[PDB]
Amino acid sequence: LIADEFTLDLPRIPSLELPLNVSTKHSSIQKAIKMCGGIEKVKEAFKEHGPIESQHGLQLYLNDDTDSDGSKSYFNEHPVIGKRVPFRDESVILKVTMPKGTLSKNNNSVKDSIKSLKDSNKLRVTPVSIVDNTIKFREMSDFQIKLDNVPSAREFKSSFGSLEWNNFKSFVNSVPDNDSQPQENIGNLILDRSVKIPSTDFQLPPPPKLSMVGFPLLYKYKANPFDVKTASFQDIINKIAKLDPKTAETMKSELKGFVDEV
Amino acid sequence: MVVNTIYIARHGYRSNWLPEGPYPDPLTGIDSDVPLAEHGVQQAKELAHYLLSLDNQPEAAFASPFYRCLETVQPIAKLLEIPVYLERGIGEWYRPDRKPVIPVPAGYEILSKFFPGVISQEWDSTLTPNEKGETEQEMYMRFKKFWPLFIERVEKEYPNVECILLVTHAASKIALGMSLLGYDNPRMSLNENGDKIRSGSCSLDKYEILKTYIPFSDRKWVLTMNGNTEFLSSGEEMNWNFDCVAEAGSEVETVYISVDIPSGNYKERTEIAKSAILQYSGLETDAPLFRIGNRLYEGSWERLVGTELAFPNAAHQSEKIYRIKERIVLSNVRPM
Amino acid sequence: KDGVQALIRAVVVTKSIKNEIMWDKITKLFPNNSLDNLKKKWTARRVRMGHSGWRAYVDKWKKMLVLAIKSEKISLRDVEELDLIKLLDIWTSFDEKEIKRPLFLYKNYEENRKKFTLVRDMSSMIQREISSLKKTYTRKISASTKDLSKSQSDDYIRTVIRSILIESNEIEALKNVGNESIDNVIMDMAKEKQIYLHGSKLECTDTLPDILENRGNYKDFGVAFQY
Amino acid sequence: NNNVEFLQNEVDLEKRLESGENGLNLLLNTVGRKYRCFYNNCSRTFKTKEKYEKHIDKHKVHELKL
Numbered sequence A: 001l002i003a004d005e006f007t008l009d010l011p012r013i014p015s016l017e018l019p020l021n022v023s024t025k026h027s028s029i030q031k032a033i034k035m036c037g038g039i040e041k042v043k044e045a046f047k048e049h050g051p052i053e054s055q056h057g058l059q060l061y062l063n064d065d066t067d068s069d070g071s072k073s074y075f076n077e078h079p080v081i082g083k084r085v086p087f088r089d090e091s092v093i094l095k096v097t098m099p100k101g102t103l104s105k106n107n108n109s110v111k112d113s114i115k116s117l118k119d120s121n122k123l124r125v126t127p128v129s130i131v132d133n134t135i136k137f138r139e140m141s142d143f144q145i146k147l148d149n150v151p152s153a154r155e156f157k158s159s160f161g162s163l164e165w166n167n168f169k170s171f172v173n174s175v176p177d178n179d180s181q182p183q184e185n186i187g188n189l190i191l192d193r194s195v196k197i198p199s200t201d202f203q204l205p206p207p208p209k210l211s212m213v214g215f216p217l218l219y220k221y222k223a224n225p226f227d228v229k230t231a232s233f234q235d236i237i238n239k240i241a242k243l244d245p246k247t248a249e250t251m252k253s254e255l256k257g258f259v260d261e262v
Numbered sequence B: 001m002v003v004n005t006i007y008i009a010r011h012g013y014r015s016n017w018l019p020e021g022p023y024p025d026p027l028t029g030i031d032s033d034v035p036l037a038e039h040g041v042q043q044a045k046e047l048a049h050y051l052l053s054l055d056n057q058p059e060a061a062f063a064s065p066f067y068r069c070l071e072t073v074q075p076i077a078k079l080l081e082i083p084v085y086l087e088r089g090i091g092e093w094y095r096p097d098r099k100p101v102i103p104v105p106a107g108y109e110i111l112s113k114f115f116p117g118v119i120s121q122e123w124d125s126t127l128t129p130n131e132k133g134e135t136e137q138e139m140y141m142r143f144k145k146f147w148p149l150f151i152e153r154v155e156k157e158y159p160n161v162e163c164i165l166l167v168t169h170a171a172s173k174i175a176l177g178m179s180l181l182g183y184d185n186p187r188m189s190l191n192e193n194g195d196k197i198r199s200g201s202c203s204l205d206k207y208e209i210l211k212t213y214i215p216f217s218d219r220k221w222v223l224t225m226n227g228n229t230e231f232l233s234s235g236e237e238m239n240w241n242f243d244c245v246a247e248a249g250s251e252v253e254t255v256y257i258s259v260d261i262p263s264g265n266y267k268e269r270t271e272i273a274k275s276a277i278l279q280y281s282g283l284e285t286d287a288p289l290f291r292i293g294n295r296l297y298e299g300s301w302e303r304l305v306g307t308e309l310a311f312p313n314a315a316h317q318s319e320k321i322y323r324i325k326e327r328i329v330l331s332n333v334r335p336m
Numbered sequence C: 001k002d003g004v005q006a007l008i009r010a011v012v013v014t015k016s017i018k019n020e021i022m023w024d025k026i027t028k029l030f031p032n033n034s035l036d037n038l039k040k041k042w043t044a045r046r047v048r049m050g051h052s053g054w055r056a057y058v059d060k061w062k063k064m065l066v067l068a069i070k071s072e073k074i075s076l077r078d079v080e081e082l083d084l085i086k087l088l089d090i091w092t093s094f095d096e097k098e099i100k101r102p103l104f105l106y107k108n109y110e111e112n113r114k115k116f117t118l119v120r121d122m123s124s125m126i127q128r129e130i131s132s133l134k135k136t137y138t139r140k141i142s143a144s145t146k147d148l149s150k151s152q153s154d155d156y157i158r159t160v161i162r163s164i165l166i167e168s169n170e171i172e173a174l175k176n177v178g179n180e181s182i183d184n185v186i187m188d189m190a191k192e193k194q195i196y197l198h199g200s201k202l203e204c205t206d207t208l209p210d211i212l213e214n215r216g217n218y219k220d221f222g223v224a225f226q227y
Numbered sequence D: 001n002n003n004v005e006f007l008q009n010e011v012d013l014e015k016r017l018e019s020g021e022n023g024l025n026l027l028l029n030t031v032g033r034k035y036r037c038f039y040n041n042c043s044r045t046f047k048t049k050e051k052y053e054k055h056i057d058k059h060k061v062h063e064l065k066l
C-alpha cells in the first residue's frame, strides 16, 4: 500500500516570524499585526526589492497601546526593524485535520495529537502552500529614552498626539510670537511642578536613531589593525582646577599620587 | 503525449439551497437549471484566483453546458484568459424515474445571450446522456466510454493543450474520477480506511501521470489533489457521495505545521521543483520519512522560538492568517 | 553537450584533488568554447543541485576514489599528473555496477524501515546580517534514538587516542573497550585529517596542536593576572 | 591541502587494518611497547610485531634443529 502522492503545484505565500508569543485568539493575532502598523504595511513590506542596506523594511513596536486621550501610550519608542530574508529556503505548510478537542487533550502539541490518533482514519493531513518570502526581526532594539516625566514632552503628547482642541489652543496660545531668551532653559516657560526634573536638564528631545548600526560591532578587545608624563602632582591638580576647583580640591584631599599607565 | 494534468471541479452554490426564498425560477426555463446564489458568485471568483496562483494553469475549460456549470466557469474564463468549450458528456445524472421530467441542457445559440464571448462553438459533444434518464450502471458506462474518446478529440482538435479543466456535477465528478482511475464501480472506497473523492461546493481535484504516443487506455493516473477547498472563505459545504440516496442539492480542529528543507549554505536558496510530488510516512513518530521529488528525507519535531504568521491571500474584509509554530525540519537521507 | 555529467565530474575531480577548478585542463577533456560555455553551464547547473547535490557528488567521488586506490585501478602518479581521462574513466567504470528507479514510500511507517535501512546525513556587516536573517531558532521536541552510551564511549575512544598522540609498555584506559571499535575511530580520524601514519607510528596532524596553541592563549592570561 | 598524501595515509591505514593489525597495535607502537622474547635464556627486544614474529619463528627453527 503506497503513501498518497500529494501535489506541490500549490500557491506560494509570504510569512512573518514575530519574536513574540502570539496566542491562538483573534484578539492576539490582530494585536500582533497592529504592532507592525496594520495589514496594509505588512503586505506592502513583502513587495520591497533592492540592496538590503537600503530596504526600509517593517517597523515593529513592542509597546503600542493608546491612553484615555487617544495619544500613544509610549510616544518615542524606536522600533525593532525587520527585513525580508535574502535567501529563504522554501518550506511546505501542512494542514492537520483533528477531531474537536484533540489538541487540548494532547497539551496543545500537534506531535502528540498525531501519535494519539496513530490508527484513526479521521486525522487528514494535506499540503496547502509553499512559503518563499519571509520577514524576520533580527537586529537589536535601539537605545530607548523615557519621556513620561519630561514637561515639554507631556505638553506635546497631550496636544499634537491627542488632537484635543482645548489642549491645542492652550498650547499655541502659549507659543511666544517671538522668543527673547532662546539661550535659557525651556523649564522657565513650562511652569508645571507635578514632574520631578533637575534644572540641569534642558529637556533636550532625543534623536530618531541613536545606534547607527543594527548589529554589534567587532571590538573583540583588539586594537585597530589598520606631555603629562613629565608633570608634578601639584601641576596635574592645578590643570584640573582650571576648569573646576571642586574636583581638584576633592582629589588633593583624597589621592596619594598619580601613576603613568606605562 | 499532450494531456498530462486533468482538473475536475463541482459547480457553485445553487439558489434553491438558501434557508428562505423567494427562490428564483430557472432563467433558461429548463427544469432544475437554477442560478448560482451569492455564495456561488463569490466562490467561483475565489477558484479563479486560486487556479491563477498555481504554476500549472489549464489551457482549455470544458463545461457541462447546464446554466450553473457555465455560470461557474464564467469568472474562471475571464480572469485566467482561456477559451471555454461545451461538453454535454460530462453532464448531470438523473435516475430514470425522475418526476416531473429528465431535464435537457440549453445550446450555444441561446447560451451566447447569457455568456457573450465566454462560450465558443468549435466543439460538438463527445457523447450524450439518455433522454429517459439513466440507471447508475448505464450512467457509469457513459463516463467509462467518454474518457478515451474525449482525450483523442482534445489532442487532435488542439495541437498543444496539456492541462484541462472540467466544470460539472457531484455524481459526474465522482464518476469521472473513479473511471479515470479505472475502478469497477464508483461506490468503491479509494483505500481500506474508507476515503472517497469528495464533492462539496466549488471542490476541485487533480489527476496526473506517474514518474511518442502511448494509449490513454494504457496510462496510469494518480489522484494528486482530492477535494481541495482551502480557497473558500466558508470552506467546503453541501458535500455529497454515491452513498447518498437523494440527487445532489435537492468540529474540524485544524492546525498547521511547516516542513523545512535547510540547505547547507547561507548564500543560496533551497527550491522545490515545479512538477514535484510529496509523500510521507510516520508523522506519529519522532523521525517521519518524507519524499519531495527525487530525494528522500528524515525529519525531527521542533517548536519555533517565536510565532510565524502566513498570509495566504497575499499569494504571488478578512485574511485567512495561518499560525505556524510546530515544524518538521528535514535532513537529507541516503538509501541503504 | 551530452557530456554535461562529464563536465560536472571534471569539476569534482579537479576541485577535490587540486583544491581548485582547473579550467585550463578541463577545456582539454570535453571540446567546447575557451572557458565561457563550460563556466556558464557549470554555474547554471550547480544552482539546480545546491550544496546538498554537490555533497552527493563529492561523497560518491571520494568513495569511488578510495575503492579504486584500495583495488589499485589507477596508479598514484596518474592522479598527481591529473590524467582526467583515466580519473573520469574510474567513475565511468564504477557507475556500471548499479541501477535504480526514483524512490517511493509505503503507508505503514515500519514497512519502510523493513524495506530500507535509510542512512542519516568573522565577516563584514552585510554578510553577518544576511547570515543572521536566514537562521531559524527552534527547540527540539523529539528525534531518532539518542544512542548516548555508544556515542559517549566512541568519544571516550577519541579522548584516549588524542591523549596518547599529543605528547609521548601498557595502555590501561582502552582495556575495557571492545577491540572492534578502535578500528572505526582511527579510520574516522584519518578521514577527518586528524592523523598521519608511518609504517607503525601514528602521529597527530598539526590541527589538534594548532587549535590548542591559538585558542588556549594562557600566556596572555598570565599578563592579565599580573596587571 | 595535502589531498593525495592524505588519501595515501587513509588507504594505507585501511590496508594495514586488514593486514591483521588490531589498530590497538598501532597505538601501542607509539605509546612505547617493545615486544620481548619469552624463550628460556632469551630476552631480545623489537619495535615492530613482524620482527618479534621472525624472532619467535627463529626459536621454532631452533626447536626443529634440536
Ligand SMILES: [Zn+2]
Pocket (backbone or CB within 6 Å): D037, D038, D039, D042, D043, D044, D055, D059
Ligand atoms: Zn628469544
